[model samples]
Target: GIEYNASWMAGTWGITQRVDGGYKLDNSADSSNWQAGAEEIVTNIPAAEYVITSFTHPAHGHLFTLRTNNNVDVSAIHPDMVPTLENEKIILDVINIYRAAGKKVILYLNSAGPSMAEERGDTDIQAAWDEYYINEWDGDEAAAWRNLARGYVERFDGLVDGYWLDNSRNLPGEVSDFVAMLRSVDPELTIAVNYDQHYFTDDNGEYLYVDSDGLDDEDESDYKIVKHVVTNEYMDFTNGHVTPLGRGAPPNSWAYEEYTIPDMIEVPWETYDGSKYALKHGWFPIRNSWSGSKAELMFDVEQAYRFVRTVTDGGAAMTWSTTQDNGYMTADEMSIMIEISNRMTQTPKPDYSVYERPKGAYLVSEI
Candidate 1:
């Protein structure tokens, strides 16, 4: 079993709601949101000590999510769990409060592909794509992204401890510049990148590696590591309902046997020892979208159980998102998260193996 601690737990918030221990507080209109978020985190999961989010840069005037090109000044806030503010005082105060209690706050930034150039009246998708996919080696477009990165890193010099770059796989140049700029401000700052690799890679950052690829039944990529911290998404260790729009089903869920429990142990068990890496595997809480109520509920509970099992028994870290991909976690789902926090002492490790795949399964091997 892994040693569970406050630093082992992390959370992401896009909307201003309390789903788990972490929340994204809204400064405008709902200024009290931050106060409530801070209080709720401390009360709900005292072991969770790190929260990742984006800060709104007042000078940029535009929220980070909507900007297609880095043309605007770097600043503003989230499209979701985003924090926008014209006043740096509130931002610093919030960061200070969290730190005073020994909690560390990290900034969230997108790597690429939040293209809004089309909304900006670009003629074609190609024009829109150009805005975010610019090559930093020789283009002004990429410069804008770098500028924004610089702006945020410089602006929040002392308050922010690290950065979580989303969709940050495969692009070496862009990611390199972003990391360099952040280190420029604070050389010791930690950085984690979301990569789509089957086995985690060291190309992203020296700190952490988040496998953006779902770790559930469908994408059965074996967990392997060399010398990096690795985390997985909620989809990674899920049971059924692997793909979007319910297209892909895992193992034997498509045919529907009368009373078959979803196979929840395979992925998590296969990756049970992933905590061997400096950064252990993680689960980002999400609402179950199975068609039937029974299946949905089963999957939801199993995901939580498997997540806790992987973290507590298998030696992995855990991350909870207050907001799901498009919405907030349901009440029951939130309760499961609370249960995860409350019941996360320690558990006996279950003996499980991913020896061989049947007709259509990813074979798990000893790495």
Candidate 2:
């Protein structure tokens, strides 16, 4: 019933190294408070924009998934992130640069904010938690989330293409209300509510799960990949959050670590309008986990590029959840992207080490 689809995604990514229009691109943890302050972010704008133009553009990619409107894990909130004109301006500035480059922006919205106001027993997990949500908007947490979502959707409607709301597991209202609220503002803006990645067993179709509370060893038992979500019928696309770990991978306690593209992505989903299609995406942190800290590569260039090409080719999206330096993608991370961009679009960063620095700056600074 909606206009966006597999063929449209094919057009977006051009032809078949992958039909990415059926697909798209996104990056996570952009401009997160865990890394810097307002001034530091403001200072890095031009530098970040420069990298977008230098690397992302050439990779033949479109769409940015920048983190904003703190609403994820109850443990990671900061007071400065609560909706403020000052904070909004900072986000707008960053979004603008990416937008100017002709890439669509999908600001990341976490559901934890509203859930916080809802009073869950587990804010007990606390960090800067209470200070960020309890004081933001007065009243029902759902209404607060609704208003907060509209603020960004209204202001950044045109500039920002949509949202990839995380922790949607605790999202404020019926997913229908949340989707309806945003579309009321910009009918074309796409939004995907995270429903957590679903893993299924085919031996029998009954719905049951062996819940493991942080035990990585349980995965060794028989866990097969299922769709990123089954609720795509009510949303635009699956949040497609993924990790690069292999089956039985132990470093990450919360994942089956076996969600690889192409290997298990042949199936499709039911879109909101009732059409069956493949508009899936698999998101994962490419550098230092999604929490953001020291930068390092968590994926391979050759395999990574192939993974992206493979999924997007089948009318699905692929997101690399990367950490930003200042207000932009880090050089080490950008280096990997540059290589993929080179592979996908057939270009080169020339100096991967300094891929994110200004176009003509020295590869290594001279004393």
Go through the candidates in order and give each one's C-alpha lDDT.
0.39, 0.44
Report lDDT (Cα) of residue 108, candidate 1: 53
lDDT of 1 by residue, 1-367 (tens): 3322223332211111221110122324243344445555555654455655454221111234222223333222223322344323445555666677676776655555224323333234324335334643255545655665565567677876766555555333466676667777786565566554332223554322222223345433332322222343211221111222232232222211111111222122333244421233332424333211123443344444444454444333444444321122334545665655555533443332322222342222212
Off by over 4 Å in 1: 1-32, 55-62, 65-94, 113-139, 169-173, 197-278, 288-306, 324-333, 345-367
Q: Candidate 2 — what's its lDDT?
A: 0.44
Question: Per-residue lDDT for 1-367 in model 2, tens only?
Answer: 5445333333122100000110121122333442233233223322221111110111111111222434342213432223333333445555554555544556565544434432433333232333444565453556655665565456566775656666666765666777778789886765666766665444576532323323343344322344476465555656665522343222222222233454335654445546634356555556445534374465666545555555555656656665555444555655666566655544342222211222222211111
Query: What is candidate 1's TM-score against the reference?
Result: 0.52
Total residue pair clashes for candidate 1: 15
Highest-TM-score candidate: 2
